[PDB]
Amino acid sequence: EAEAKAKALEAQYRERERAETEALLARYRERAEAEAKAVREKAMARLDEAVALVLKEVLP
Amino acid sequence: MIQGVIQKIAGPAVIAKGMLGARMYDICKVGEEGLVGEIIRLDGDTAFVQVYEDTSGLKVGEPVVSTGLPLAVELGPGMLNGIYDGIQRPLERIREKTGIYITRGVVVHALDREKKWAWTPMVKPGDEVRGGMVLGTVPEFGFTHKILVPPDVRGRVKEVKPAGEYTVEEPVVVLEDGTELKMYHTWPVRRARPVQRKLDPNTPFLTGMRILDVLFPVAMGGTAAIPGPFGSGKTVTQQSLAKWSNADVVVYVGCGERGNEMTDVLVEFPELTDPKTGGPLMHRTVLIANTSNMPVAAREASIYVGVTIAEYFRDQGFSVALMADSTSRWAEALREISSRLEEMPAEEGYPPYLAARLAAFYERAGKVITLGGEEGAVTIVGAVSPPGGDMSEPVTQSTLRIVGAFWRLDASLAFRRHFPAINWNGSYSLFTSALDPWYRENVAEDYPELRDAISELLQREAGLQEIVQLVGPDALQDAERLVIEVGRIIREDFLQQNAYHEVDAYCSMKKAYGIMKMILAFYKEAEAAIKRGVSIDEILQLPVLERIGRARYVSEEEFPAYFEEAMKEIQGAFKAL
Amino acid sequence: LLKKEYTGITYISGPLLFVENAKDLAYGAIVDIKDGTGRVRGGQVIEVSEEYAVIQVFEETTGLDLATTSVSLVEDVARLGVSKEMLGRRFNGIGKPIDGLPPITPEKRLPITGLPLNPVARRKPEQFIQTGISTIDVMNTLVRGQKLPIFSGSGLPANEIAAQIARQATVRPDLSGEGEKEEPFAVVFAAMGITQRELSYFIQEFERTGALSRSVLFLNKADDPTIERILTPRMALTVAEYLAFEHDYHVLVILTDMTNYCEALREIGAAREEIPGRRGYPGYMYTDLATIYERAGVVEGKKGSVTQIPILSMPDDDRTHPIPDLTGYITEGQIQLSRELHRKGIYPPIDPLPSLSRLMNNGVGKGKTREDHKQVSDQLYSAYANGVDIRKLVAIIGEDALTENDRRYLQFADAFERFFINQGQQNRSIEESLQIAWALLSMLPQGELKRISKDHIGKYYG
Amino acid sequence: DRTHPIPDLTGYITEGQIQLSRELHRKGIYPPIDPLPSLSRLMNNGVGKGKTREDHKQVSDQLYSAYANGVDIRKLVAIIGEDALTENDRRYLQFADAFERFFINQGQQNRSIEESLQIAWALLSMLPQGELKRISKDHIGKYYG
Amino acid sequence: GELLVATARTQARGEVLEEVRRRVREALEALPQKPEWPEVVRKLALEALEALPGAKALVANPEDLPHLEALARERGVELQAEPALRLGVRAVGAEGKTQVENSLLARLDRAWDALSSKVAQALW
Ligand SMILES: Nc1ncnc2c1ncn2[C@@H]1O[C@H](COP(=O)(O)OP(=O)(O)O)[C@@H](O)[C@H]1O
């Protein structure tokens, strides 16, 4: 019966670590797409001066 | 198209001038006959054509015509049940037209341009095709030989010829571009067939012996080497690997090897039976022979043609087994093309890029998922014939850094006729860890513990063999001595495969495991029975011991009925003492 | 930047190609070779005259001809564009990213061949490291900022010991007073001719133990062309010198299988007919192994470090082949895995008598590990060495003719080899390893232990 | 030594070896072929029913087994005393001596194939039948006189 | 998951710089319609024959074979047309075998490294 109780603890225990795994990983995924959208917000916010900088320094 | 004429003819190398612009490692027809040679060392406007065939009789002034391609094999349907020479031209058609001698510069197609194959497509017009996608299939012998788009080609299908029967040279799938796709395609041998990604091996390659699948296993995408001095087998084991495997096809490449080997394989294979499908065992093997007296420059390319054809059957999703025989004779060919080219050698004449070439050969193995998405693997077994025994070669060490399992044949243990001559001190295997899920699934639960016990008995017996030679072998106490007698029973029963017997030449995992269990039950109950106190002189003449020593001789189907009775006779035998 | 393109290639053979009427290439410059079908290869100028220039060629040489193949100059000194946002990436042997991610935006352009560090400006490597391997942490002590390689044989487990070290190597501030502040290790993992079977082992090992977020990987597989191994250790050490000495990391550099590198330059040095050392390796190879290995160590005034574990695969597993011979004349220590102990199932199969670490005496002792450390090491070597040379005497006279305080030697030896060396994948701290060493030394009679001072032999024996 | 390039490079191309021995020569035995290092890598074809007499392969096998066992025990009888050895070992020593005095040392005569085979059975009748493991019992019944 | 966030950051950053660079190639290949470009092509031809002493010939797109011709008679150099060479002009040196390319495409793809550091610094 101690073995049966160890197995039941193990089964609910598997479920515990797997639920924590899935919630935290999908959390980090949606924060990742938010960070991608943040730097794409920065992208067109200043892009013309960068094109102007390289388009001055590559020209003779 | 860059055409020139011969300037110098130094042995089997021809230096042609006038060839400004011909690329390196092209294939150029030399001579007025049209021999096949290959460019190395461009210099100024000058090639350096090594010719593959012999070169007696070429004058100066004969044309040398480049073809503008590197050495290409033709891959398509019609190769199985086929003996090909080094540059892939079918020797049976050479014997049809030429005679019974191999002459110089015969030109035949590797795949027969007249054969009718049934075509059954698997695409529609408008379907996209990419590299390595299947198009349709052809039933060859017992196979669904599935043709596949060349690995460079992409696009969309414009029109497909419907299901009939055709020829290899028939343009069967036209793209939306003007690209034809026939049933064959050519591939340069010094480039790898690409893969999508490479799985790690977790599945054994059942070699069908009893030492090389129990003690020193080798996985499916694995590389293994058999180094051995002469007269220690090394060819009977290559043939027992040719017959008794679980490979779906077998590419047996012999380069620089006895011709009687290849005619044994041609005569006795079409009357065997592969224990997987039925049908002749010759219907799955492609064998590329380049016998020792056939010209020495082609046994460089023979290895590459073998590994390319095995990769093609890999990309069709099989478990191919390539067996290179005498890679050291290949390395000798690299030496003779190097010293002809006047290089500065290193370590016994061999050019210093020896390990570069040999490493890139052995690297093409492995278990991958192909570009079509279906998985498949090619294993590689390489025979090494080092010169004087003397495993401290350059060829042996250069291959030893990169192969995964190592099988040392000793010729001292094959001069008292112990076959197979695989030493178990010196031979090792690195795939023994990753197969244990497969063993604990599919042969037993305690099979790793069991072969660990067998290897411990062999280590104890071999470390005790020194005092056995030193002082009297009757002058040792008897519980120690029982280790010696069970070591004798192991190495004269469990590692004693006959290979000429009709039922001992193949032993599956169940029968290997049964003989292991018999020996360990005998060992455990005799150790305990001598802890009780009995006579070791009486413990040996038990008639259950011949029942063990011939348990490797009963069939695979009449084994478990033999086995459970012998196990009960063990306990019934050690009650009565 | 304009691009000059030379042509007039005279000679292409093996690795080398030439270009005549080419004077404006610097020595040691990079070139890219541009064949007829539009494909860039890499190359590097190794000799310049007023007539010609000899280029060695990194990729393979198939498909080149002489009426095409323009040669274009790039990077008159060979550089690496180094950045700090580089610690999650893979690379191949030229630095080109092979994980699909975009190339990095170079904060600096470091020269790849390094500069010799100034022997005034070094610092004596002081601080202990522990590896959880007891043979290493007791008898051959590794300290931070140290070259020591792993000599191994054909088929021994050396990749597992190097991955085990890099998994669990930590620095102990409990025994030194530094304060915790614990910085773990960046790992620069360079690899030269690994097959797939070892690469899958290291990548599965790192992605399990959570190290691919701190490690930069320089993979040169064994089907990539066999000369960019000449660039790969310099790539890894330029990255390591950056990340250590300008961002205060504690970098650990794993240089896999230097035998492949040394054969990669035997190949080049015998395309040039350069007069060799012994067994074909060129006369200058000591300087190349020196210019790799001696880019390690700590700096006075900074917090960085570079610790090197190179790997060797000794050919006929001897210490007399030129590669282990020279590699031990440069570095400071080696640990030799022995083939004989491996067949006994012992893991990590180190044997202590042919292994050593020259910087033990800096970093062990009172105040920094424990006061009895060095003497325990001495006595273990003495006792185990005496046990081995009495095994060589067992090998003729039989076990019976040994007296006493000889059988305790003979039992010390194999109790040592199967309780101290043998361990699984467990991490034993320095207190565990020392108390196991005292447990093993307790078998000997107390009057025999003649290299241990009397206070330490009092307060630990038994 | 076999590791010289002419013995080993012949040994790779050929189909076995027949090795004369120095030690059998000094005992006046002629032709001094010892049978332990020698073998034919072929000869499964060229023996047996029709091509030879029926019992050929098994007799050749049993001679090699018994002579190997006898030469091992007279290696060991040089070490241990020449009386501390059991009952069958005396017949193996007498078989090895009778073998190398009658079977090998043929001198000048041109033995037929049946004279060689009946000398083979004449030497195998110096052994108990339970010591004859490889020969299947039909040939034991017909021959073994 | 921290690896996932980091890889998202680096790929979005790289797509930003590739967007910048594609816009730059667009503005470069939209130079030769706007009449400041034949004022420019002479400057890079000038520096090319500066760095290449003994420059035998010039080869260009016939956009500026009629243009540079009188702007290169005083150069003492021959002029020829082999088009597909936009946005620049290259200098064939002594009897072949050495040639100097100067062109806006090549100047971009060979200055892009230091310009990537400085552009990413000005952008972020
Ligand atoms: N054509 C060549 N290709 C490759 N290596 C060469 C070639 N010619 C010479 N070498 C090697 O380079 C060295 C050249 O030395 P040398 O020409 O005398 O002076 P320098 O050091 O100025 O080149 C020689 O030792 C030789 O080994």
* Domain layout of chain B by residue ranges: 1-71, 72-114+182-429, 115-181, 430-577
State yes or no: B234 annotated in a binding site. yes
Residue at token pair 């083979």: D120
CA distances from B38 to B15, B167, B295, B467, C109 (A): 11, 31, 15, 60, 42
| Burial zone of E2 (CB within 10 Å; 0-12 exposed, 13-18 middle, 19+ buried) | exposed
Q: How many CB atoms lie within 10 A of CB E22?
A: 10
Span from the CA of E13 to the centroid of ligand 1 (angstroms)? 48
- Is residue C219 within 8 Å of residue C91, measured between CB atoms? yes
Buried/exposed B270-287: b ≥16 CB within 10 Å, e otherwise? eeeebeeeeebbbbbbbb
B472 in contact with D, Cβ within 8 Å: yes
Name the nearest CA neighbour of B211 among B389, B422, B36: B422
CATH topology of domain B430-577: 1.10.1140
Collapsing DSSP states into helix, strand and coil, what is residue C189?
strand
- Is residue E86 within 8 Å of residue E32, measured between CB atoms? yes
List the single residue in C with minimal CA-CA distance to E45: C2
Identify the structural domains of chain C with CATH numbers, from first to last: 1-462 (3.40.50.12240)
Superfamily name with CATH number, domain B72-114+182-429: P-loop containing nucleotide triphosphate hydrolases (3.40.50.300)
Q: What is the dihedral of CA B509, B511, B515, B521, to 10 degrees?
A: 90
Q: For residue C101, give the nearest of E10, E111, E113 by CB distance.
A: E10
- The DSSP letter of residue D13 is H
**Would the CB of C20 count as within 6 Å of ligand 1?**
no
Contact of chains D and E by CB distance (3 or more pairs under 8 angstroms):
no
Side-chain-side CA neighbours of C165 within 13 Å: the count stands at 30
Name the nearest CA neighbour of B404 among B226, B242, B244: B226
C212 in contact with E, Cβ within 8 Å: yes
Residue E7 Cα, gap to closest chain C Cα (Å): 8
Q: Which residues of E touch A47 (CB under 8 A)?
A: 19-20, 23, 123
Helices B478-489 + B447-470 axis angle, to 10? 120
Span from the CA of C77 to the centroid of ligand 1 (angstroms)? 21
Question: Rounded to whole angstroms, how far apart are CA atoms C106 and B545?
Answer: 75
Name the nearest CA neighbour of C438 among C370, C359, C392, C385: C370
Question: Rounded to whole angstroms, how far apart are CA atoms B234 and B254?
Answer: 13
Degrees to nearest 5, angle at CA B210 with B207 and B216: 70
Phi-psi region at B417: left, alpha or beta (left = phi > 0; alpha = psi -120 to 50) = left
- Is residue B148 within 8 Å of residue B198, measured between CB atoms? no
| Burial zone of B501 (CB within 10 Å; 0-12 exposed, 13-18 middle, 19+ buried) | exposed
CA distances from B447 to A9, B519, D136 (A): 30, 14, 35
Question: Rounded to whole angstroms, how far apart are CA atoms C277 and D123?
Answer: 62
Q: Where are the alpha helices (DSSP H) in B533-575?
A: 544-549, 559-575
Residue E35 Cα, gap to closest chain C Cα (Å): 23
Pocket test for ligand 1, best of C273, C274, C284 (most atoms within 8 A of CB): C273
Question: Rounded to whole angstroms, how far apart are CA atoms B387 and C423?
Answer: 40
- The DSSP letter of residue E1 is -
**Would the CB of C273 count as within 6 Å of ligand 1?**
yes
Question: Rounded to whole angstroms, how far apart are CA atoms B454 and B440?
Answer: 17
Residue C74: CB partners within 8 Å, gap ≥ 6?
A: C29, C30, C31, C32, E110
Question: Rounded to whole angstroms, how far apart are CA atoms E60 and E81?
Answer: 5
Which helix (H) or strand (E) segment is B15 a member of? strand B13-17
Name the nearest CA neighbour of C307 among C89, C90, C111, C136: C136
**Would the CB of C50 count as within 6 Å of ligand 1?**
no
Question: Rounded to whole angstroms, how far apart are CA atoms E28 and E103?
Answer: 10
Beta-carbon contacts below 8 Å between A and E: 83
- Is residue C279 within 8 Å of residue C321, measured between CB atoms? yes
Q: How many CB atoms lie within 10 A of CB D119?
A: 15
Which helix (H) or strand (E) segment is C6 a member of? strand C3-6
C386 in contact with E, Cβ within 8 Å: no
According to DSSP, the residues that pair with B145 across neighbouring strands are B138
CATH topology of domain E35-124: hypothetical protein PF0899 fold (3.30.2320)
Pocket test for ligand 1, best of C16, C272, C284 (most atoms within 8 A of CB): C272
Question: Rounded to whole angstroms, how far apart are CA atoms C121 and C361?
Answer: 21
- Is residue C158 within 8 Å of residue C152, measured between CB atoms? yes
Q: What secondary structure does DSSP assign to B156-224, as a single string? A: EEEEE--SSEE-TTS--EEESSS-EE-S-EEEETTSPPP-SEEEPP-SB---SSSSTTTTS--BTT-EE
Residue B261: CB partners within 8 Å, gap ≥ 6?
A: B235, B239, B254, B325
**Would the CB of C274 count as within 6 Å of ligand 1?**
yes
CA distances from C273 to B288, B345, C228, C281, C323 (A): 37, 9, 20, 11, 20
Residue at token pair 């006038």: B18
Question: Rounded to whole angstroms, how far apart are CA atoms C190 and C215?
Answer: 10
Q: Which residues of D touch B388 (CB under 8 A)?
A: 3-5, 8
Which tokens belong to C433?
């390893």
Name the nearest CA neighbour of B64 among B89, B43, B38: B38
- Which of the residues E11, E13, E97 would you substitute to probe the C interface, choosing the one with the greatest number of C C-beta atoms within 10 Å? E97
Tell me, rounded to whole angstroms, the distance of Cα E109 from its chain centroid: 8
**Subunits in contact with chain B (3 or more CB pairs closer than 8 Å):** C, D
Span from the CA of C272 to the centroid of ligand 1 (angstroms)? 7
**Would the CB of C54 count as within 6 Å of ligand 1?**
yes
Name the nearest CA neighbour of B574 among B551, B546, B544: B544
Question: Closest residue (by CA) to atom 11 of ligand 1?
Answer: C272
Question: Rounded to whole angstroms, how far apart are CA atoms C355 and C312?
Answer: 14
Question: Rounded to whole angstroms, how far apart are CA atoms C305 and C299?
Answer: 7
Q: For residue B415, give the nearest of D4, D5, D37 by CB distance.
A: D37
| Burial zone of A10 (CB within 10 Å; 0-12 exposed, 13-18 middle, 19+ buried) | exposed
Question: Rounded to whole angstroms, how far apart are CA atoms B133 and B372?
Answer: 5
Binary contact (B258, D16; C-beta < 8 A)? no
Question: Rounded to whole angstroms, how far apart are CA atoms C441 and B436?
Answer: 38
Question: Rounded to whole angstroms, how far apart are CA atoms C69 and C71?
Answer: 6
Span from the CA of C9 to the centroid of ligand 1 (angstroms)? 18
Question: Rounded to whole angstroms, how far apart are CA atoms B468 and B449?
Answer: 28
Which helix (H) or strand (E) segment is B380 a member of? strand B375-384
Pairing mode, if any, of strands C11-13 and C79-82? Answer: unpaired
Collapsing DSSP states into helix, strand and coil, what is residue B457?
helix
List the single residue in C with minimal CA-CA distance to E98: C6
Question: Rounded to whole angstroms, how far apart are CA atoms C112 and C107?
Answer: 15
Query: What is the layout of strands, in order, in the sheet containing C70-74?
Result: B42-43, C11-13, C16-20, C52-57, C40-48, C30-34, C70-74, C3-6, E98-103, E88-92, E57-60, E78-81
Question: Rounded to whole angstroms, how far apart are CA atoms C145 and A15?
Answer: 45
Query: How would you write B26-65 as a 3-class SS string?
Result: CEEEECCCCEEEEECCEECCECCEEECCCCCCCCCCCEEE
Select the CATH number that applies to the domain covering B115-181 from these four: 2.40.50.100, 1.10.3720.10, 2.60.120.10, 1.10.1760.20: 2.40.50.100
Side-chain-side CA neighbours of C460 within 13 Å: the count stands at 22
Name the nearest CA neighbour of B66 among B18, B105, B122: B18
According to DSSP, the residues that pair with C150 across neighbouring strands are C311, C335
Phi-psi region at C310: left, alpha or beta (left = phi > 0; alpha = psi -120 to 50) = beta
**Would the CB of C139 count as within 6 Å of ligand 1?**
no
Q: What is the dihedral of CA B540, B542, B547, B549, to 10 degrees?
A: 10
Name the nearest CA neighbour of C442 among C462, C414, C417, C458: C462
Q: How many CB atoms lie within 10 A of CB E5?
A: 17
